[PDB]
Design an enzyme around this catalytic site. Sequence first.
Site, PDB file in Angstrom:
ATOM      1  N   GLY A  10       0.804  -1.199   0.000  1.00 36.16           N
ATOM      2  CA  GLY A  10       0.000   0.000   0.000  1.00 36.16           C
ATOM      3  C   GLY A  10       0.843   1.256   0.000  1.00 36.16           C
ATOM      4  CD  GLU A  62      -3.382   4.162  -7.134  1.00 34.73           C
ATOM      5  OE1 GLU A  62      -3.170   4.293  -5.910  1.00 34.73           O
ATOM      6  OE2 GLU A  62      -4.187   4.883  -7.763  1.00 34.73           O
ATOM      7  CB  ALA A  90      -7.981  -2.283  -2.890  1.00 35.05           C
ATOM      8  N   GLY A 134      -6.751   1.507   4.723  1.00 39.34           N
ATOM      9  CA  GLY A 134      -6.821   1.256   3.302  1.00 39.34           C
ATOM     10  C   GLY A 134      -7.532  -0.037   2.963  1.00 39.34           C
ATOM     11  CB  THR A 136      -4.044  -1.942  -0.814  1.00 35.53           C
ATOM     12  OG1 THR A 136      -4.719  -1.450  -1.975  1.00 35.53           O
ATOM     13  CG2 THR A 136      -2.921  -2.852  -1.239  1.00 35.53           C
ATOM     14  CD  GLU A 174      -9.404   6.100   8.306  1.00 37.20           C
ATOM     15  OE1 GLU A 174      -9.940   6.669   9.280  1.00 37.20           O
ATOM     16  OE2 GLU A 174      -8.300   6.450   7.841  1.00 37.20           O
ATOM     17  CG  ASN A 197      -1.041   9.481  10.321  1.00 41.53           C
ATOM     18  OD1 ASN A 197       0.152   9.283  10.121  1.00 41.53           O
ATOM     19  ND2 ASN A 197      -1.987   8.908   9.600  1.00 41.53           N
ATOM     20  CE1 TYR A 215      -0.104  11.759   6.315  1.00 45.52           C
ATOM     21  CE2 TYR A 215      -0.186  11.598   3.944  1.00 45.52           C
ATOM     22  CZ  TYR A 215      -0.823  11.627   5.160  1.00 45.52           C
ATOM     23  OH  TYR A 215      -2.189  11.529   5.225  1.00 45.52           O
ATOM     24  CD  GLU A 245      17.298 -12.462  25.072  1.00 48.21           C
ATOM     25  OE1 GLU A 245      17.995 -12.329  24.043  1.00 48.21           O
ATOM     26  OE2 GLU A 245      17.794 -12.666  26.200  1.00 48.21           O
TER      27      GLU A 245
END
EC number: 3.6.5.-
Lengths: 430, 428, 426, 249
Positions: A10, A62, A90, A134, A136, A174, A197, A215, A245
């Site tokens: 994605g 894509e 998608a 997403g 995807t 979402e 975010n 971003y 571990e």
Amino acid sequence: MRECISIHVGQAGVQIGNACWELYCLEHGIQPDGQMPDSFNTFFSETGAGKHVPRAVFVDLEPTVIDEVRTGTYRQLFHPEQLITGKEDAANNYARGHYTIGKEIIDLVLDRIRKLADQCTGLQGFLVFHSFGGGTGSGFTSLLMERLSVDYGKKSKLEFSIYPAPQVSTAVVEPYNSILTTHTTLEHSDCAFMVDNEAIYDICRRNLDIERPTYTNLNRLISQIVSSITASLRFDGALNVDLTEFQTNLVPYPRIHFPLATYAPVISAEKAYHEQLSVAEITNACFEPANQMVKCDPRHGKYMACCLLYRGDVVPKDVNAAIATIKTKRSIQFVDWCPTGFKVGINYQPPTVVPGGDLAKVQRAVCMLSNTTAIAEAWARLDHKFDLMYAKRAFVHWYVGEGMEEGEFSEAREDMAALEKDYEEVGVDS
Amino acid sequence: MRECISIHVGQAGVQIGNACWELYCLEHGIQPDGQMPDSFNTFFSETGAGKHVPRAVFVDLEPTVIDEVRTGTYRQLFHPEQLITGKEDAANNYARGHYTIGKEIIDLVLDRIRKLADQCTGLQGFLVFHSFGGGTGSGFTSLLMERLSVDYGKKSKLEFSIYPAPQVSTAVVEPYNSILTTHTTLEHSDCAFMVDNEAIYDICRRNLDIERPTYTNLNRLISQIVSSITASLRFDGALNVDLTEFQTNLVPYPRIHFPLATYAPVISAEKAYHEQLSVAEITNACFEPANQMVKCDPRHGKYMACCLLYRGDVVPKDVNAAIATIKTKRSIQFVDWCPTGFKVGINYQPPTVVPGGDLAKVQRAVCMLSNTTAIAEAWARLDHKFDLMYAKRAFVHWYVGEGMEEGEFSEAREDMAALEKDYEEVGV
Amino acid sequence: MREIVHIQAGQCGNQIGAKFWEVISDEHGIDPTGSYHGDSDLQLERINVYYNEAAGNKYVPRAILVDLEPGTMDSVRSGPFGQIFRPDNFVFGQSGAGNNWAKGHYTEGAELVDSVLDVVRKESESCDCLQGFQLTHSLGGGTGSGMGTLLISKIREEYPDRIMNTFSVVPSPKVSDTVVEPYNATLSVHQLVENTDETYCIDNEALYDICFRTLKLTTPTYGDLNHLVSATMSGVTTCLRFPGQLNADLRKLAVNMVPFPRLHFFMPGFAPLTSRGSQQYRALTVPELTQQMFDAKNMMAACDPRHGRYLTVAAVFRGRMSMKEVDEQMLNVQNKNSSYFVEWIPNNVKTAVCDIPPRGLKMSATFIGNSTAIQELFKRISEQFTAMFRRKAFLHWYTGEGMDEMEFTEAESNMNDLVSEYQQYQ
Amino acid sequence: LFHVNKSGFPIDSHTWERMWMHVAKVHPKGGEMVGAIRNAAFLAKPSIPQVPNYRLSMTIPDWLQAIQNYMKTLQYNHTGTQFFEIRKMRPLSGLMETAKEMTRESLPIKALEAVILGIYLTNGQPSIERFPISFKTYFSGNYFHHVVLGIYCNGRYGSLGMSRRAELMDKPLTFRTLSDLIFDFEDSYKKYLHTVKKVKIGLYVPHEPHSFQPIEWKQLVLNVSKMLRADIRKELEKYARDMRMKILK
Ligand SMILES: Nc1nc2c(ncn2[C@@H]2O[C@H](COP(=O)(O)CP(=O)(O)OP(=O)(O)O)[C@@H](O)[C@H]2O)c(=O)[nH]1
Ligand SMILES: Nc1nc2c(ncn2[C@@H]2O[C@H](COP(=O)(O)OP(=O)(O)OP(=O)(O)O)[C@@H](O)[C@H]2O)c(=O)[nH]1
Ligand SMILES: Nc1nc2c(ncn2[C@@H]2O[C@H](COP(=O)(O)OP(=O)(O)OP(=O)(O)O)[C@@H](O)[C@H]2O)c(=O)[nH]1
Ligand SMILES: [Mg+2]
Ligand SMILES: [Mg+2]
Ligand SMILES: [Mg+2]
């Protein structure tokens, strides 16, 4: 003889992987064209004449983001077969990524994994990067992880997802994607590290003093955390902690493996001069609620187990002293059935700073991972979102049109309710 | 090991903090940018590469003065986050500072006080600077002092307030703000140090012979006193007096902790040539009524406990002779139940002089602190002012409309009646 | 004659053993290359105790190294005095045991165990008179605990008529760097009791206390702690290598310290430990050493000896001293502190004097006290175990390797049994 | 002591037989009515009380009265067995889920879940504001505890709650001061010859239902018995002022 292979799916996963491989090429001295001018063996393969090939598989239904990588500055780093592309996205649809459009590509990626895992001798696990929102990052990750789990039963898989934020969001469907992905992320993976975010936006606005972060900054921070996690595999220090571990140290019960990450010290180059940044300071900076990268308050929960991966100029006496002062504090509440709850690890390689970025060249840094019960809030809000939409059956026709069945929507919700109930019933006293 | 953190609130607090930190920088040799070209440990922290950061927290609800500090000549000294600001001042209103505008900012400052206190191995106490007249320096200091008392229940807090003067004033609602601030400064403090602007104006008009003074001179004098108080933690001397030793010998009863400072010798740079400045003379000058930094008459009251913090070229024999000469005077009337009331401390560090200030390069100085009973009158006048306005309920609609209630005025006034009764009770 | 085989398992054991070999080689005057550049023939007389002669007249340690992760072999061989070892004695695995007892004892260690028995067998059948074995390991882990337990069980099954000496670093509550320590510690010490002749419980907290308080070190790294442990190690077995007025091999200590078969867990010590600043304000005499050894702030196990009588005590002195001095001192030590000794043992002190002291000293002494207070060091661990096993926390990782739940109850039951047996004599 | 259901619903066999053994033991006659109710072929179906809905026209004191009569109608539990397990430290949202499922089932209620029900009912009114009150008291050589929910609507103090006794669980909005309310509770407590020892007051509860803020109960605590009532009143009025201005934190 100690390795793990990375899969980026994605737009979000590929874009984080860009920053990640920039960082790794920077740390070991590899040029962008892959030519060095034996610690690289964890992530790079040598193929004669000094050419270094990352063990990465870039995938996207894509072609635009993968084409951007193909034309970018690292066109010469990856060999071309790894960058796999579909024909049409998608389109934020789980059912297109999983059932309809995922079928035509899945074999073409699985065999590539079968190639890469056949080149290494000792393999420790997988580093999958995706996003929940997403179509995807949800459906295609579901398909891929199902196939790998039935294929390699006993290889740890580490998801590094991006959970949707409470208020900030950039899509209308979402909750339907995240609730559907909750089934794959549980029961197949081994340690999923949620990230938001909004939290990193706040961190960049406050600590780093950036009013307009994009971003790229978020990707750089997440890359720093992943490079801190996969640091005991590449360098050497007083205490070394590989994947299994810290997997045994963190996961108390088989069905609760969702730690939330943290990093310190995140400071601008200007405020560094007025700061000392000793071990005690950075250790205390990890536990304040204004540094968690999930928009949830850890003060309304308890820590089951913790893991404090130090790196740089640190010595164990300072770490023991800092852990003692942490244990004295009554605000930081641990759970009674875990009398010792710290897995310490020290490394000698200090953090690396990318030239184009904005982070101070500090001398020591700590990455804190916590299996706290405060994570349930980050889930609970999202369930409410689902409850508001599924009541009206809004947008369901898009999903059922791609062959998906409607009962799965309720099955995923009851699974998520079971997960929250199990996560809450532990942590009770005695 | 011996560390104090100072908090400056309001315009007056920040503007006095400017002079205080200039004085400490000159004392310990630190440049304005923090680079020195171990006594500094009390106020400063080293941060590698020889850069010293103050242990300070500047606070205000208005970004007009802190902005001047940020763009001033000391921009590179303070940690950038220590300087904390709001958007709109308290507007000379107690309720705007204590309830409405103060609650949106208190957490951001308590977090930094916690962060600073974590860096201290051994913490002595706080040093809060504020003013009674303001709305920021009354309401916000009340809020902050309550929170600090809840958090750090053991450390001692020393206030340095600017009490309103009898005649000169620059505000119409000073009595209300002062009477409201008195509850916090009586309940949560340990030693409140009151100051007047008229008294210091008169001091500069008489001794320094400055006919047109301004706030810079006043702040420089107050800063000199504060540097004299905390000299025993930083430097060394024959008789050292830290904060807890200082508090004992001055506070006989838990509520009687309102002394008033003094300083000597304050003179012009030219008048020092003709003047001897021996120990006896400065000791006598400290006790005159014309050198008190509160517009009050010590002759109409008795000294309960006293403390003479010397510094510079002094030895204990002259101090003892001076105190003997003082104790035989008839105008200097002490209380019967305190047969000895002189705490003495000596340092080898003489006073410093700022380059731009109008003060002489003296060789020995004394800071004289007194828990006398005359200060009741300095309060009494202000109560009279309150009684004139509250009868008409003038200006009360602002306070009630901001969130506060009306009974607080009456109970603050009755608490001041109780305090004055207590001060009159002793010394009988 | 009376040769000793030395084994090392895990990172902690490997590092302590490396420091031990540096100390021993320096004591005997051995080149880092393995050649001999000594001065006194006493060094070469009993070189065979720890070393094998090899053609070209070089001395190779009689050591075996094992770990499940190959990084520690690289670190040990790269470090100083790493080339003396024979390469074929190194035994490595694919990846470490994480921190999992069941992984290092049932699933991943059982495949590598045959190689370690084979090299141990070759080393032990290439000698005439074998005294015993010496292992270094840590209880709080997967490799040093599980693999070490498996190794001692197999070796004891194959040599019933020898002795063992495991210098195990127990886990302490204050300094803790792992989340599953109590499980591993209990599971290992379940098997140390029945398959060992002596065990010297070192601890990290007490060692750090020694560095900060006595040595006055600003930044104690693991090197210093390993150096102290190595000093104790070299002290314990000095009588097998040098002459002395009154000497004592390992079996003499075994038959003196141990009244009853289960009680063989010791707590060591060492003197003189002195800071760099305070060198010149001491006399360096037998009274100073004797007072420093019995100081409660000098034991290497984080225990307070005042809460328990000493069953039996040993003190292997090292240097040129008179013997009347030692006898009178360790007689009046017992008389002065009679409340801290056992009434039903007429004499609680076995001494031993060796002429050759450490390199950088005029005299020294090694304290080996069998105190009954050691139960505390186990009691705390038991508490932590009951905190976790009540809720079965972290337990599925151990059941995933084919280890049942009843093993944990068995180990805890035995643990309480041993603690009760030690408490019985107070 | 009374035991707590923890098997969700329906009630498991162990808690079932335990409750029946308890009620058989305590009931002096015992087995007769117990066995009669066990083996009763047909019994009257209890009605479902309807949850009242807020209406703007009718006044707020009548609203508190209405919630009180509904709670009275819900047949206060004296079976000695809690049916809905509550945790004090649990986040608020779990308590909202507990409250709404409890209203759905409509079973007997004790004081703690009664005040939780009161919070759930009154959560819809920003004008209304509510908080908890607790008492630790002494009687007959044993200590006991009680909890109620105070309200500060329209500048007046009132109280809701539950008890086996009558006047210890309900007061109207007719108190100028919190001190008068707590002293009235103290006098009603003395009426049963029970001595209050300690009194505890928490905070105003947030008005957001789906939040993780826990409920505070110990922000203020005094030993009421030792101290004379004047100081108690003064400290309490100071605390009430500190609360209604939202200063405390
Ligand atoms: N004196 C020393 N103590 C150490 C040293 N290394 C570790 N220790 C201690 O050992 C304790 C745990 O021991 P280890 O990590 O070696 C467990 P081990 O490596 O044998 O098993 P694996 O983890 O499966 O490799 C750790 O908490 C440290 O406190 C050391 O080098 N010196
Ligand atoms: N941190 C971070 N998050 C991103 C980035 N790009 C997209 N996201 C997140 O991804 C979410 C949307 O899902 P995507 O990952 O874009 O969906 P996709 O993987 O492209 O799959 P398709 O919808 O089929 O194209 C948004 O809510 C963003 O928060 C990025 O560069 N960095
Ligand atoms: N000695 C001295 N007094 C000052 C100084 N600045 C202000 N003051 C006094 O402070 C009193 C009023 O308090 P302010 O500080 O102005 O008010 P505030 O505390 O800032 O609160 P706000 O009104 O909301 O801004 C006046 O009567 C002044 O005499 C100063 O620099 N030196
Ligand atoms: Mg896309
Ligand atoms: Mg102002
Ligand atoms: Mg290891």
